Amino acid sequence: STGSATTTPIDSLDDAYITPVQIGTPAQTLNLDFDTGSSDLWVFSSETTASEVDGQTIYTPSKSTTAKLLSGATWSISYGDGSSSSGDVYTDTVSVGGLTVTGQAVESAKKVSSSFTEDSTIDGLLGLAFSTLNTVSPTQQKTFFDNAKASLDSPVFTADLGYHAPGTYNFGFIDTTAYTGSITYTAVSTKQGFWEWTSTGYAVGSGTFKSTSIDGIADTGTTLLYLPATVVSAYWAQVSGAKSSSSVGGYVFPCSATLPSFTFGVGSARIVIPGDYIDFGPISTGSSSCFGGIQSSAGIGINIFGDVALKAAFVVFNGATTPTLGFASK
Secondary structure, eight states: OOOEEEEESSSTTTOOOEEEETTTTTTEEEEEEEEETOEEEOBBTTTTTTOOOSSSOOOOOOTTTTEEEEEEEEEEOOOOOOOOOEEEEEHHHHHEEEEEEEEEEEEEEEOOOOOHHOOTOOOOOHHHHHHHGGOOOOSOOOHHHHHHHHSSSSEEEEEEEOSSOOOOOOOSSSOTTTTSSSEEEOOBOOOOSSEEEEEEEEEEETSOOEEEEEEEEEEEOOOOEOHHHHHHHHHTTSSSTTTTTTTEEEEEEEOOOOOOEEEEEEEEEEEEEOOOGGEEESSTTSSSSEESEEOOOTTTTSEEHHHHHHHSEEEEEEEOOEEEEEEEEO
């Protein structure tokens, strides 16, 4: 089997991407944030504290003839940005882009933090990291991909995120029309539960490539590119007037600037992030200070190849017995 679904930016800045997902019988379609940096599929629901729902579409398990309470199971997750959610668990039929999994754990939120409430466009998350990170207790549950894997034509999924445009998540096949040149594959460590890999270096603009190992994660659920302070300083030093602002919470730059590109290495291959992908717009409405899309990972504890990086590439998440990651230009 295979699946193919379009993923759409939630706003004009590509702050996140939503993908429609069918849950239950008859189908209830929710728009979920596919997140290769976590491993829980959770949704706003009829169980979510009413004051914490503001415009989201909810899953109502009582209206699904295939929903079953997973008795005694609870979940609770906290993300790197300080957001969180928790609740109980149903199993139900879940379909993405024509690919159907029966008996998928659907984690129903009883509580969500303010950042989730305030984002009316995101109805929940669909985790695509390794199932070892799944938070369901006392019986850990598998991700949608893990459940689908054996049925897929090939044990892979791909992320093809757009810049200010829709893109695609495919399951079970590689669309050879979706990228240019060849796909370069690179080793993955699953030791921390992530799609963790080592970039071979970087360049800023038309500058020379610096060969240096940068361990980090391919994380579709993180907006920005978070890299070591040395790398990030080298980038922003090429933008007149750019500075790190503790009050704003990162590097800002004059909105009048033209940003240089940023290149990262994948083995001997190179992925170029155009400068415009690094512009996250005014820090507040009407401001002439703009927020940067490359930020320091110092104090996160991990480097994160988020959407800023991934949307410059066609990315293969190869879930074979020994997982790997592939990157192609597009």
